[PDB]
Symmetry: C3
Subunit: 289 residues, 3 copies
């Protein structure tokens, strides 16, 4: 798409992660992804205006240009690179197709992963799980990639769905699905047939690189109302942050936080979305690692 051109022109030329990072986790690179959601994507911009003070005793630090410097030892920063929104809000109305959102997301993730940033794609419908993990396996076909998937639904009955696509491509050496509460016979047959683990409503303890995929639908509609067909009986924001805290790994391959649609949110009297508040926290503590 001509829409991503300016995003694309930007992702390429970011000064690579240097030798300041030796056997070091990070850095993180952030962008806004808008597939399957309305044309206006705040949330990213809402996350950038949010407190930098984390739940745990580390602090986010946001940079637009490179190179960026590594913190030392015991004093914790968390330097995050803002690549901004995929969609240029000033270069047309020609909104991309699923192939265009994908090819770009694949190209961004690839160009973020090449440089040693941990990619984090925020917004959209969850399609940016497929592309980002596929950029990783392209780069590192030797690395075993697993996925920790948080949603109200397994999101696997449909062959188009991004986890179903990965499983069948044998890119996934395993799927951990957490929070599921809308399970059909389609989801349960595909479950024991691809031997994945699940926890419907301690330590993960693995040496396998973790992709983290977070559907806002996993929370309760009370905390995250801004989803398609919201599913009650869900997680509190704190419930997710707890379980998220306990994810183990040698490294995170990437993070896709999706499912949020401004039009479906419950709003304060000053026009702030409950789901924006909730998810803005979720992204923060997803970066903290």
């Amino acid at each position: 798409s001509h829409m991503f051109s300016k995003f694309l022109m930007n992702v390429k030329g970011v000064t690579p992660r240097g030798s300041d990072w030796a056997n070091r986790l990070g850095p993180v690179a952030l962008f806004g992804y808008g597939a399957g959601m309305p044309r206006r994507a705040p949330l990213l911009d809402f996350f950038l205006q949010s407190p930098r003070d984390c739940d745990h005793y580390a602090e986010l630090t946001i940079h637009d240009k490179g190179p960026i410097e590594c913190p030392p030892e015991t004093v914790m920063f968390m330097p995050v690179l803002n690549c901004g929104q995929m969609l240029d809000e000033a270069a047309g109305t020609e909104t991309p197709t699923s192939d265009e959102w994908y090819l770009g997301s694949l190209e961004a993730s690839t160009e973020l992963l090449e440089k040693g940033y941990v990619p984090v794609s925020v917004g959209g419908d969850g399609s940016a799980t497929l592309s980002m993990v596929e950029a990783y396996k392209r780069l590192f076909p030797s690395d075993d990639i697993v996925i920790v998937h948080f949603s109200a639904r397994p999101s696997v009955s449909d062959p188009r769905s991004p986890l179903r696509v990965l499983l069948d491509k044998g890119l996934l050496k395993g799927v951990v699905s957490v929070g599921n509460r809308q399970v059909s016979s389609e989801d349960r047959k595909v479950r024991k047939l691809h031997k994945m683990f699940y926890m419907d409503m301690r330590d993960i303890r693995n040496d396998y690189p973790v992709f983290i995929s977070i559907d806002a639908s996993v929370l309760d509609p009370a905390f995250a109302p801004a989803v398609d067909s919201p599913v009650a009986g869900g997680l509190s924001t704190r419930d997710l942050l707890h379980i998220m805290n306990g994810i183990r790994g040698p490294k995170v391959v990437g993070i896709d936080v999706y499912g949020y649609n401004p039009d479906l949110d419950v709003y304060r009297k000053d026009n702030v979305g409950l789901t924006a508040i909730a998810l803005s926290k979720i992204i923060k503590e997803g970066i903290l690692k």
Copy 2:
């Protein structure tokens, strides 16, 4: 009332539960009850448009005509009969009185119970607890009926209130009141005087037929804002679903889910009520048995 005529004409002629059910639980028969709430009652209709996929590994199946067939053994369906709304939305504006809502609810429940459907009355103010359990004791005066009551208040200080009426009629061999957090000296005197059990904010393990009465007021106002004088410090939707899961019995005599008023709800930006979402789940997993 002339309003129920079409509902009444309909409840009578439903093809009875057959020999497909031998020593079998169910089937379920659904209707919408509107006493003490505005004339428009969605929720029923909102429940019918909701996902059929339960929290637990069974699936609801909704039929308008009879007879319906019984599932086999290990593969779980949950066939539910839609009797629709009491109030015909096209036969007048003459909204019934408390005697009319009662006489009908009594007549529906009686005509649902005669045929071996487990009645489930959705909407209203909780008056459809009194009528439905009284249709049961009319049919089965030998059967001991207990009630598991979920509300923010005991709803017993007032002699008009539907549990207070049953207790004094000695139809109730016991009351389990769960979730209470607005208790007056009126409620507490009537408590130790009618020796009922309560749990204000494991297994029930009884052989006594269970009526299940669910006031949306039992949840938190965060999850179920759509109630008269909402009471904070309440249940999450998941909290109720847990405690509900643990109800024991030889059979359920019926289920009344009430307390919901569209006018009092908090709404998403697309006009969906938080309480509708919450309660639509509650009814589902109330049928699952």
Copy 3:
């Protein structure tokens, strides 16, 4: 301020607590405090229209004139004196300054504490923590005052902030900060330097007089959306009520419930604020002691 004149004229002449109270806890004296929030302060008035039935088996009793009588032994009442709003809604538009809000709050608290009422200041931004505990130490400089502080932030990095001011004045023999989830390096340095205890997201067991300071920001934005920069991952209303229940002491020096701003709230379809509902409960069970 000329605004408080009518409030001031009123606080002075309240008939003192008599000999009906001998080695007795209470009574309580209530007023509405509006510092740092819009000119309209409902909440107080919303609390007065709320159910008197507590979570625990005691009942609030609200009196406007004095003297009031003490309950006997095992039968529990909780007689609370309504001093109304600081700001007279009919004597000008000249809204006070931070010195005026303070001098008055200091004068009210002093004139409430002199007479043996436990002061409870409802509304505002939390400034009514500083004044009320300083009226206490003026009266009783011998008494060791500690504070149990509930907020999303430690509220101590800023030298203007009311707990930071007390600590440095050595009025505080200790600070218990509960619920914190936005902690900067400013908050953490000031923490181990003033040796206070904290619990970010059994019995307190102390003989030290307790001030209770409650920022609505401590709850989750799902339960209490009506705060400045709301912080997700918070307490449920029930979570706070539990932890609040477990506060120990020889006496409470006072209670400031703040952080609520009508303009920032999520509202039902009938214009009731979720935060009003939540906080109206919080004040109730804060008085119960």
